[PDB]
Amino acid sequence: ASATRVIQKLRNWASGQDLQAKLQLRYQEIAKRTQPPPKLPVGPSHKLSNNYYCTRDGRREVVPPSIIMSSQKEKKAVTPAPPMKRWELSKDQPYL
Amino acid sequence: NLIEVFVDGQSVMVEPGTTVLQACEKVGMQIPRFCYHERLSVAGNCRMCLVEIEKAPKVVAACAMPVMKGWNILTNSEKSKKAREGVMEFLLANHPLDCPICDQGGECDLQDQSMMF
Amino acid sequence: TSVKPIFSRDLNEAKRRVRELYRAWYREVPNTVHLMQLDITVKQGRDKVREMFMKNAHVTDPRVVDLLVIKGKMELQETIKVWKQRTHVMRFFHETETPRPKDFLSKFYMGHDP
Amino acid sequence: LKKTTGLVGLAVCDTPHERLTILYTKTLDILKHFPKHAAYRKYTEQITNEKLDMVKAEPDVKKLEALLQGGEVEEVILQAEKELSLARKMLKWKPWEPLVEEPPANQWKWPI
Amino acid sequence: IKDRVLYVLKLYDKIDPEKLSVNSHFMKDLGLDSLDQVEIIMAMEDEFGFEIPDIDAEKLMCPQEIVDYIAD
Amino acid sequence: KRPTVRPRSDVTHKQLSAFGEYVAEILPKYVQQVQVSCLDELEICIHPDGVIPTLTFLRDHTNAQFKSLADLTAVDVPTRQNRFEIVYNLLSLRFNSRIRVKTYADELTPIDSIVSVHIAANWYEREVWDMFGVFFFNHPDLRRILTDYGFEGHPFRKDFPLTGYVELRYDDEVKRVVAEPVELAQEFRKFDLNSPWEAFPAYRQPP
Ligand code: SF4
Numbered sequence: 140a141s142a143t144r145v146i147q148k149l150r151n152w153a154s155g156q157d158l159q160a161k162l163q164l165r166y167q168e169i170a171k172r173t174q175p176p177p178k179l180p181v182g183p184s185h186k187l188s189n190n191y192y193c194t195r196d197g198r199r200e201v202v203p204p205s206i207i208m209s210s211q212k213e214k215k216a217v218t219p220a221p222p223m224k225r226w227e228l229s230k231d232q233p234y235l
Numbered sequence: 236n237l238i239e240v241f242v243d244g245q246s247v248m249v250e251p252g253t254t255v256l257q258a259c260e261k262v263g264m265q266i267p268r269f270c271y272h273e274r275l276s277v278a279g280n281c282r283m284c285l286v287e288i289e290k291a292p293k294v295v296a297a298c299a300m301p302v303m304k305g306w307n308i309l310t311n312s313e314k315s316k317k318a319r320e321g322v323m324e325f326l327l328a329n330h331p332l333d334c335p336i337c338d339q340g341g342e343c344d345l346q347d348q349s350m351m352f
Numbered sequence: 353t354s355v356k357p358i359f360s361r362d363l364n365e366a367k368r369r370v371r372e373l374y375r376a377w378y379r380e381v382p383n384t385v386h387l388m389q390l391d392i393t394v395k396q397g398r399d400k401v402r403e404m405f406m407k408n409a410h411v412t413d414p415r416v417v418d419l420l421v422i423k424g425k426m427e428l429q430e431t432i433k434v435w436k437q438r439t440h441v442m443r444f445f446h447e448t449e450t451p452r453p454k455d456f457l458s459k460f461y462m463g464h465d466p
Numbered sequence: 467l468k469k470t471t472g473l474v475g476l477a478v479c480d481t482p483h484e485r486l487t488i489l490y491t492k493t494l495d496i497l498k499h500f501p502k503h504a505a506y507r508k509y510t511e512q513i514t515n516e517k518l519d520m521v522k523a524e525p526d527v528k529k530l531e532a533l534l535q536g537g538e539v540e541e542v543i544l545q546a547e548k549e550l551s552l553a554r555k556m557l558k559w560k561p562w563e564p565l566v567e568e569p570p571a572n573q574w575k576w577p578i
Numbered sequence: 579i580k581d582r583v584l585y586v587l588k589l590y591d592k593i594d595p596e597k598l599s600v601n602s603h604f605m606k607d608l609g610l611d612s613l614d615q616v617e618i619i620m621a622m623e624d625e626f627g628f629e630i631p632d633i634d635a636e637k638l639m640c641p642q643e644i645v646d647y648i649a650d
Numbered sequence: 651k652r653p654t655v656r657p658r659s660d661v662t663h664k665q666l667s668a669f670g671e672y673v674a675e676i677l678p679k680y681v682q683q684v685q686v687s688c689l690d691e692l693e694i695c696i697h698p699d700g701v702i703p704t705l706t707f708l709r710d711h712t713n714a715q716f717k718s719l720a721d722l723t724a725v726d727v728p729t730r731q732n733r734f735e736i737v738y739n740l741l742s743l744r745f746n747s748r749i750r751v752k753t754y755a756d757e758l759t760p761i762d763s764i765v766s767v768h769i770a771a772n773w774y775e776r777e778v779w780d781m782f783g784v785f786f787f788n789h790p791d792l793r794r795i796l797t798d799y800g801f802e803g804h805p806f807r808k809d810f811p812l813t814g815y816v817e818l819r820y821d822d823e824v825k826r827v828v829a830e831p832v833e834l835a836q837e838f839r840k841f842d843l844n845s846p847w848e849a850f851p852a853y854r855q856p857p
């Protein structure tokens with residue numbers, strides 16, 4: 140930014156765009172360091188009641204699988220899951 | 236002479252003068268323990284060995300209670316897990332924070348039972 | 353007993369393949385010690401070959417023999433289509449290793465191996 | 467109308483519905499070789515029957531496609547050819563037969 | 579023929595200590611191994627610009643039949 | 651609902667179960683131990699004598715279109731006769747789904763390849779043969795890909811240790827880069843971690 144008006148004009152004619160508005164370097168366009176000591180929140184699990192773990196066990200709701208056609212233990216044509224819904228173009232720039 | 240039990244539906248044959256805990260062992264499900272050691276006498280101080288007894292409302296202590304024919308036991312049920320949660324909250328109320336210093340750091344039955352149950 | 357075979361049915365077919373492979377290695381070695389500027393003699397190379405063969409002579413299973421054959425063929429491909437180098441090929445001779453003393457007293461005086 | 471598909475390795479097919487009738491009729495004519503107690507027949511029969519009904523009920527591709535709800539017509543044709551080959555191969559194999567050889571017991575047991 | 583065959587044998591490393599006759603049995607009269615035998619047959623094939631399958635190469639455990647084959 | 655738990659839905663656990671019954675009744679042979687996991691996945695165990703039939707079926711049959719072999723893998727469990735577990739993770743687009751095929755195998759019991767169908771396996775099979783020791787027929791090029799061109803053994807098993815048997819170093823005495831036996835400096839600490847107290851009373855195993 141410390142540079143000259145004519146050089147600004149020249150580089151801008153060369154490129155095609157503007158640069159003083161979208162520079163890459165950083166002239167006080169940042170957030171100051173030495174930020175203040177913050178205070179934080181907690182989750183919905185820091186209550187005092189109705190927080191019994193048995194409700195939200197998490198890794199005990201798991202249950203082993205449900206086997207089918209083991210070796211010891213009319214109809215329609217089906218699939219593993221419904222098909223894929225075809226996509227559509229965008230509202231902004233579908234071409235390029 | 237034998238006696239019958241139906242744990243979680245699963246059936247078991249045992250002797251009299253027996254204990255809920257020795258039955259659950261015969262089956263495999265380990266029951267918690269603080270005041271029990273097969274090579275000692277028995278008491279009911281800790282109060283972490285609690286379970287649920289279908290057809291009867293009140294919980295019991297599986298380190299002292301002798302099993303009565305026909306009882307369906309329930310170990311991992313609601314009342315049991317809640318009893319254990321409360322009991323360990325109580326214990327750890329005052330157990331100081333010397334886990335690091337405590338030479339019994341990685342073998343602490345209480346550490347493990349808190350982390351799990 | 354009642355099992356499934358691999359590439360063969362008996363020690364004899366296993367051994368005909370093995371002999372083909374011996375022919376390959378024997379007819380090959382010179383090309384190696386001539387392409388990669390080695391030092392050892394063709395005779396020493398063939399000695400190593402026949403030794404690596406003899407050291408699997410307590411074998412009975414055609415499956416084992418055939419897997420060993422497959423691995424030997426892989427290595428032969430690797431060699432003749434030169435990918436292994438001087439190092440890759442001389443890694444056999446234990447050229448930087450004191451022959452493990454089998455003299456019980458040697459083992460005693462030196463270390464703890466029984 | 468059109469100029470291309472949107473993929474690579476495909477073609478602007480100008481003779482649809484005809485290749486489709488051909489391929490589906492041939493599938494069924496092969497299925498004729500299959501014992502009725504083979505589920506592959508018992509299923510793909512009706513699948514192809516419904517596909518034929520759909521091509522006959524919709525003559526324009528730009529709607530037949532979205533109706534089949536599968537890929538584009540060329541993908542459909544390719545997949546039908548693939549099912550044809552699959553049939554010719556399951557005919558040499560005897561899958562509908564019972565099981566080959568049950569495994570040992572502690573094989574599918576996880577944990578361990 | 580036989581002359582250059584016996585010369586090859588005399589040349590071979592661990593063979594021809596005393597005998598390289600035309601009739602001997604390699605694995606029986608000389609008490610040798612299939613590996614060494616294959617070495618012999620490879621030497622012969624390279625002498626004669628010839629090719630052999632391992633099958634008949636092992637069938638020919640007898641110098642007489644060996645020279646019969648190289649004649650054939 | 652609770653914040654710290656995913657939703658265990660029904661749509662998938664039902665659709666994939668229907669598809670499992672489907673494939674089972676189609677291939678009463680070359681199949682055993684179908685199953686659906688508690689987390690919306692399908693596994694299909696099969697004899698090694700049905701691999702290519704199963705794969706061709708799943709690639710071609712319209713209702714499956716399991717085209718892309720997203721992965722091929724091995725696993726080793728030594729407490730059984732057939733100790734290796736070969737795994738194929740497959741993907742289909744039209745139906746936006748995945749699937750898992752398993753087949754047991756063993757050292758000294760090779761397998762039938764699939765290169766005719768999914769050319770991706772041409773290299774996963776090389777990996778397998780290099781690392782574990784499982785063999786594949788009808789494979790054009792099968793050679794050590796990852797490890798050295800002279801390496802010997804089968805590392806990704808559970809017996810071939812971590813550190814390995816040999817180390818390398820240069821020895822000016824010969825100027826080469828030779829391989830000598832492992833004499834480490836520090837020892838591989840092995841921390842005993844498995845805690846006794848059972849946490850999962852549902853995956854238990856009685857005597
Ligand atoms: S490790 Fe266990 S015994 Fe030691 S201080 Fe912690 S809770 Fe107490």
Ligand code: FES
Nearest residue numbers: 270281282284298
């Ligand atoms: S184990 Fe202590 S009260 Fe039962």
